[PDB]
Design a protein around this nucleic acid. Structure first.
Ligand SMILES: [K+]
Ligand SMILES: [K+]
Ligand SMILES: [K+]
Ligand SMILES: [K+]
Ligand SMILES: [K+]
Ligand SMILES: [K+]
Ligand SMILES: [Mg+2]
Ligand SMILES: [Mg+2]
Ligand SMILES: [Mg+2]
Ligand SMILES: [Mg+2]
Ligand SMILES: [Mg+2]
Ligand SMILES: [Mg+2]
Ligand SMILES: [Mg+2]
Ligand SMILES: [Mg+2]
Ligand SMILES: [Mg+2]
Ligand SMILES: [Mg+2]
Ligand SMILES: [Mg+2]
Ligand SMILES: [Mg+2]
Ligand SMILES: [Mg+2]
Ligand SMILES: [Mg+2]
Ligand SMILES: [Mg+2]
Ligand SMILES: [Mg+2]
Ligand SMILES: [Mg+2]
Ligand SMILES: [Mg+2]
Ligand SMILES: [Mg+2]
Ligand SMILES: [Mg+2]
Ligand SMILES: [Mg+2]
Ligand SMILES: [Mg+2]
Ligand SMILES: [Mg+2]
Ligand SMILES: [Mg+2]
Ligand SMILES: [Mg+2]
Ligand SMILES: [Mg+2]
Ligand SMILES: [Zn+2]
Lengths: 43, 38, 38, 122, 18, 162, 101, 51, 60, 222
RNA sequence: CCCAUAGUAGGCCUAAAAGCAGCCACCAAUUAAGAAAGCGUUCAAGCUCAACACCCACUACCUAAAAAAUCCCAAACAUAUAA
RNA sequence: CUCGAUGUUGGAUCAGGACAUCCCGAUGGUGCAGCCGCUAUUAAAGGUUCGUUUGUUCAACGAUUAAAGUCCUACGUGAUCU
């Protein structure tokens, strides 16, 4: 009974997507790597 | 597609959506709750 | 009863009580003041 | 419009707190970089694809050594989100002609000039 | 289906002068 | 505590009050500086609905909750204990604190459904006829949100909605 | 006072309040006296006599209520609160009135 | 003592390293004596060959 | 809103182009089906209704 | 013995000769003939004008972007004038009369055929802009009753504020950014192009810093 | 929660305006109570609030719902050391 | 999406479903005396007429009925019919 009008991931009405716990951790893990890259480019 | 300004809250890109979740405000947490101290 | 999204007491005799999982307004003085949470 | 990004120079100014966290010495900067690509160039603009080729980072997870000079760092700043930058460490100094064939790059960034494949007797 | 109006602005099709 | 006794002798009603034995707090609390009984014994965030030994100290003989002023609990822990007592009653962990019944009233037989961590009163919850899509699923709450800060010995946090 | 005024003092004949003001366990009895001695409560039945007896004998406070039916209500406020005595006093009024009528 | 006062897993006390070092030597000597006297039958091995 | 009348191929068989307007206080009924669009019919049906009720108020 | 406190005196506050809100017209005195583009950026981002009190002490703060047409002005003018006390209160407009032309095509027309004719005029309002400012011989509680009523009828999120509440609101936000324990912030990541995040962000996000999304303002973002 | 007397129905206007249709003043009796904040009366009565007394009510002052047409929709789980 | 064809009104036939309930059931409020009504909550098991004119869907009108419900179903259904 619950259907997304049109295609799911495109359009004015989209199927909502939610950030999981591991999705945040993966982004934070890559953020830490790039933060250390900023330090080594400063000298 | 939709324009930059819309009447409804436009669905964010997933890359942007993960950025918003990561950068949320985290209030400081005291080691001991103030109501438990004299 | 009248379904309402915001419950307000219409006089001093109205009292808020939570019954059957939703809030109600009851008034013995003025029964027309009775409201039901929607 | 999506264009190239101008990173402010304030980003690349290390604070004293950063030095303690990463252990670097501002008065004795590391001579060489250890650049490893950890992200794909796909779904990235073409100018990032070209710079990766210029730096010899076509294959991911393959360490590459580059000089710590402003011109090389300028290219790194463009693709800093696709790479891991580590300083090259020389516990026994630069390799010599005698020990050229006995070198190994450890995961700690140290280039050891002797590699015996034997446990330590200590 | 209704018959619509017409644009009253003409010209302005010049190319860039380089 | 204090009790009230009503006696009728010679068609005369006499109401009297007497003082019974009053329990005292155990000596030398580990945290004397605590402002409420829960944190004076380092029990904050360290009890659940099934810890009836702790919960029975803050309830009336018929199962009702005691006032916060009398017990001296803080507002935060008073609500935690109040919800834990409700879940204990619904789980059948307090058989000796049943509601008072007037004379001549015998409850009828009712189906026995074992339950625990019951947040809401069973008689006031509607069935989930339409679960909904995966992105808007109607969940079944388990436990109470006031116990979210309890010390969790597992890496996975408490799932308050099933 | 307001709650007691609604019920009234029709089935009550005489209310006697005995307490020792110099004691430390007569505050509840005095509070009961204030509620009963209110103009609203006394106006419900002018045939009901409210008597306040003050003694220095050291005896515990006592409240004696006499109804028209002849039954007596005695509430000892030494270890009772004013609210509890009022509720017991109101309950007897609601019952003695029904028996008489 | 409440349900959350102590961790659910039972406490584990590791042996004293000074005492356990002596215990390890006894076990190694016991197994070594088996090889000297040939107190073993068929032997199976796990070898790393061709990746 | 209701389907029009006339020799007009398939458009009427599915499209409710005709508009009927009834003024409850006066009981006047105005119908218009000249135009293919209901909105075009609705506006003219209003205009006839306005004109007819303009006379009624004059008569009133 | 109940402890009393001194009350403030308003005897030094003067009241203008026209305390009530002036009438606002649908269209300017001279109608505009040059049709203007949509220009959605006029309601996007923080407001750089009418963000501070001028004469009054109480006002309605706009918490989002939107357009005000003549219907909204009549709602504001009628409610405020009726619910105010002219002898002790006065109200002024902090927004201009509707001036931005809005074009509507004829109903039922297909796409094309030029641009539609001008239909009405609206006033663009950004987040953080005062709409109506009030003041005089009154407290905030007296005027907060109907200002919040008007605020919830606006097309954008709004809230009645005072000189003290608005200062507290701004100082609270500054405190939130100061004690934020999150090592990662939207401003730091966006400006530094960390993770190549600017490929999915907007150039305006360098200055909005994640606090604004379209016409919406999020006070909880730090 | 508890409790409410009085100069006085202030003056003016008004057929009448008595705290509560308008206008002006907004002083004063009592330890304590506004020439009256909300209801009400044709005008008055009448019911509350702001008073005193009693006394640790020792309050939060941040918010809100739902409906479609073949048949809900993985099954389940709040507890054993973050991998 | 379909023009190397997915056959259009309305009717007949058979109806499936939604409830935003026309009738029947259970309730709250009333400017609910009663008899009739108005409004709201709940309820989709059951039922929801025959005719004159018009190709009609409608609408008007006649006589009734506890009531003559609103919609979806490729504007339900033409390898069933007209
Ligand atoms: K879509
Ligand atoms: K709004
Ligand atoms: K008057
Ligand atoms: K075709
Ligand atoms: K049916
Ligand atoms: K015919
Ligand atoms: Mg689809
Ligand atoms: Mg676009
Ligand atoms: Mg040009
Ligand atoms: Mg050109
Ligand atoms: Mg030229
Ligand atoms: Mg709950
Ligand atoms: Mg023809
Ligand atoms: Mg033709
Ligand atoms: Mg007076
Ligand atoms: Mg007067
Ligand atoms: Mg009057
Ligand atoms: Mg006045
Ligand atoms: Mg009076
Ligand atoms: Mg009072
Ligand atoms: Mg299933
Ligand atoms: Mg599966
Ligand atoms: Mg074919
Ligand atoms: Mg048919
Ligand atoms: Mg059917
Ligand atoms: Mg229903
Ligand atoms: Mg339903
Ligand atoms: Mg039936
Ligand atoms: Mg009734
Ligand atoms: Mg069909
Ligand atoms: Mg067929
Ligand atoms: Mg057919
Ligand atoms: Zn009421």
């Amino acid at each position: 009974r619950g259907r997304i009008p049109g295609r799911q991931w495109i359009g004015k009405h989209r199927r909502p997507r939610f950030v999981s716990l591991r999705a945040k951790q993966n982004m934070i893990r890559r953020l830490e790597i790039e933060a250390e890259n900023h330090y080594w480019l400063s000298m | 597609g939709s324009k930059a300004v819309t009447r409804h809250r436009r669905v964010m890109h997933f890359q942007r959506q993960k950025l918003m979740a990561v950068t949320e405000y985290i209030p400081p947490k005291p080691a001991i709750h103030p109501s438990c101290l004299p | 009863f009248k379904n309402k999204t915001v419950l307000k007491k219409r006089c001093k005799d109205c009292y808020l009580v939570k019954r059957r999982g939703r809030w109600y307004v009851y008034c013995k003085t003025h029964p027309r003041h009775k409201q039901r949470q929607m | 419009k999506f264009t190239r990004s101008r990173i402010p120079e304030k980003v690349f100014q290390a604070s004293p707190e950063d030095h303690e966290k990463y252990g670097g010495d501002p008065q004795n900067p590391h001579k060489l970089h250890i650049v490893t690509r950890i992200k794909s160039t796909r779904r990235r603009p073409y100018w990032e694809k070209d710079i990766i080729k210029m730096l010899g980072l076509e294959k991911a997870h393959t360490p590459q050594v580059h000089k710590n000079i402003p011109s090389v760092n300028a290219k790194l700043k463009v693709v800093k989100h696709l790479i891991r930058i580590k300083p090259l460490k020389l516990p026994q100094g630069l390799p010599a002609e005698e020990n050229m064939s006995n070198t190994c790059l450890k995961s700690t960034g140290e280039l050891v000039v002797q590699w015996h494949l034997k446990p330590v007797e200590q | 289906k209704k018959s619509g109006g017409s644009s009253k602005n003409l010209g302005g099709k010049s190319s860039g002068r380089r | 505590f204090r009790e009230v006794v009503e006696t009728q002798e010679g068609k005369t009603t006499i109401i009297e009050g007497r003082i019974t034995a009053t329990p005292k707090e155990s000596p030398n609390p580990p945290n004397p500086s605590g402002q409420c009984p829960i944190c004076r014994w380092n029990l904050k965030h360290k009890y659940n609905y099934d810890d009836v030994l702790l919960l029975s100290q803050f309830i009336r003989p018929h199962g009702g909750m005691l006032p916060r002023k009398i017990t001296g609990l803080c507002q935060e822990e008073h609500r935690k204990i109040e919800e834990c007592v409700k879940m204990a009653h619904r789980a059948g962990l307090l058989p000796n604190h049943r509601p008072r019944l007037p004379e001549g009233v015998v409850p009828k037989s009712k189906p026995q459904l074992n339950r625990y961590l019951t947040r809401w009163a069973p008689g006031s919850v509607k069935p989930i006829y339409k679960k909904g899509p995966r992105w808007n699923r109607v969940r079944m709450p388990v436990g109470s949100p006031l116990l979210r800060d309890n010390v969790c010995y597992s890496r996975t946090p408490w799932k308050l909605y099933h | 006072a307001a709650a007691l005024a609604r019920l009234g003092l029709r089935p009550v004949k005489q209310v006697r309040v005995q307490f020792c003001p110099f004691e430390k366990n007569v505050e509840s009895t005095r509070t009961f006296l204030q509620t009963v001695s209110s103009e609203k409560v006394r106006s419900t039945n002018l045939n009901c006599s409210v008597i306040a007896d003050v003694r220095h004998d050291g005896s515990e406070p006592c409240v004696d209520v006499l109804f028209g039916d002849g039954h007596r209500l005695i509430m000892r406020g030494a270890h009772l609160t004013a609210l509890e005595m009022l509720t017991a006093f109101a309950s007897h009024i609601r019952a003695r009135d029904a028996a008489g009528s | 003592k409440t349900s959350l006062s102590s961790p659910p897993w039972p406490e584990v006390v590791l042996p004293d390293p000074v005492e356990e070092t002596r215990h390890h030597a006894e076990v190694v000597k016991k197994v070594n004596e088996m090889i000297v006297t040939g107190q073993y039958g068929r032997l199976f091995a796990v070898v790393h060959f061709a990746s | 809103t209701f389907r029009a009348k006339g020799a007009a191929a398939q458009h009427v068989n599915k499209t409710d182009s005709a508009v009927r307007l009834v003024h409850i206080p006066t009981g006047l009924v105005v119908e218009c089906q000249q135009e293919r669009s209901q909105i075009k019919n609705k506006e003219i049906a209003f205009r006839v209704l306005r004109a007819r009720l303009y006379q009624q108020i004059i008569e009133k | 013995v109940k402890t009393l406190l001194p009350v403030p005196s308003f005897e030094d506050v003067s009241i203008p000769e026209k305390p009530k809100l002036r009438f606002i017209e649908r269209a300017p005195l001279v109608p505009k003939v040059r049709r203007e583009p949509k220009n959605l950026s006029d309601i996007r981002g923080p407001s750089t004008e009418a963000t501070e009190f001028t004469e009054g002490n109480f006002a309605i703060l706009a918490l989002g972007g939107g357009y005000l047409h003549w219907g909204h002005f009549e709602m504001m003018r009628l409610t405020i004038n009726r619910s105010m006390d002219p002898k002790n209160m006065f109200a002024i407009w902090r927004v201009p009369a509707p001036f931005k032309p809005i074009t509507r095509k004829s109903v039922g027309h297909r796409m094309g055929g030029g641009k539609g004719a001008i239909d009405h005029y609206v006033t663009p309002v950004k987040a953080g802009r005062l709409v109506v400012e009030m003041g005089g011989r009154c407290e905030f509680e007296e005027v907060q009753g109907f200002l919040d009523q008007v605020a919830h009828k606006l097309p954008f999120a709004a809230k009645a504020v005072s000189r003290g509440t608005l200062e507290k609101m701004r100082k609270d936000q500054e405190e939130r950014e100061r004690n934020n324990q999150n090592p990662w912030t939207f401003e730091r990541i966006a400006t530094a192009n960390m993770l190549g995040i600017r490929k999915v962000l907007s150039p305006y996000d360098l200055t909005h810093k994640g606090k604004y999304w379209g016409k919406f303002y999020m006070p909880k973002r730090v």
